[PDB]
Design a protein around this ligand. Sequence first.
Ligand SMILES: CC(C)[C@H](N)C(=O)N1CCOCC1
Length: 461
Amino acid sequence: EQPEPDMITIFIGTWNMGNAPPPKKITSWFLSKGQGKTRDDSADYIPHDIYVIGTQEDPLSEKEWLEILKHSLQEITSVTFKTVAIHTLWNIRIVVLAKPEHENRISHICTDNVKTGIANTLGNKGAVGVSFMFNGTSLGFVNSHLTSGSEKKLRRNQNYMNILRFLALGDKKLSPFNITHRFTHLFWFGDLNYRVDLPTWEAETIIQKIKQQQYADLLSHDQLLTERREQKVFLHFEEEEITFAPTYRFERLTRDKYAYTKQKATGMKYNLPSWCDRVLWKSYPLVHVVCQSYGSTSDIMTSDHSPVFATFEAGVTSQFVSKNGPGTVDSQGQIEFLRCYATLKTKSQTKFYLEFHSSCLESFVKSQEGENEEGSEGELVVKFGETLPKLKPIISDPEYLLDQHILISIKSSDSDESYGEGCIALRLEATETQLPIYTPLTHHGELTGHFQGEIKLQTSQ
Ligand SMILES: CC(C)[C@H](N)C(=O)N1CCOCC1
């Protein structure tokens, strides 16, 4: 037998195809060749472990697109990839392909979609997603096509919050947790449709800057970067530095021209050159994740968007079995919390309790109610002191336990509704030692408070 991997590489692609069939060759996309952070030529024959393809305005049948994708990867790698999942909402599609050696490592495949907007605004924008387990590691993938238009960044932020609330991926037992907490690694990509927010009269200046590869002054006005910096969207997500030209809006059949001027076909809106097409991620604390490419193709010109690629190294763990767990506790293992308190932004006064969720526990654990005090600056402080239960992991082996994570929800005793969710890594500097812990708490992806204190982890070593 193959040894189980402790690392895999994942290819993420996002392309708004502009309702046009692709050209006969799209291999440059899967090879991370073009502009930006590109992949070394020496890696060209080396397959990624998993390929996740997100399309928007995709005119192809699932069958048509699968044939082009599989044939493309076969030509690059000489490997016949297995289809893990395919899911389409209108013209928004996600395909997950993996090397055949991974077929038995992949389980718990989930697909879902969310339609964004109401009446007028419901009919073609939203998201599709896929999750699964790769051995002991949970992976989520979201392909979203958000509201278009330079003057709708707020709508895009709203679309993002509706997708992260309502996309039903991952372990349904994680009931207090949205997709931004359910996965070891979460990749969120698509035509996010955020624009370079400069005056219309500066169109030709923007084009000039693009021809000089001087992106700095454009990225300082990129609505996704500015909204993220003001914590309006994609809180606690990462994005690699952008070093490729804006991927929208091109004249078709060339990349020599940006088509930005207002037309009946655009609803009389300008489309200033923009980084519409993006890849972000969020991984659990102290898990290996390294972006190894982030760029756009130069040679695929059927759409008014260029394809975007990103590749990642992602840490993965094995499906651990001991003499004891799974199927029982390992009395040599324990997780203890000392001097713990939650700080909440809520103006309400109910009692709160904690829930601890982790795949290292047989099931989730509910604490006693904490003691509410007033913070010096208005805040609600919920004190747990030394009252939190002792968590009993299924496996005590430090090779397993130090790789695990504890999700925390703080819940109202009156309503059992979560006011905040966060995550604590057990990748500690020491065992049998009081060490500080910390997580921000979010609800619907917005900051709602903090959890901090100390942890004491006992393993079999
Ligand atoms: C399975 C579905 C998501 C299907 N592929 C689809 O896109 N639609 C049917 C339901 O309503 C929206 C349109």
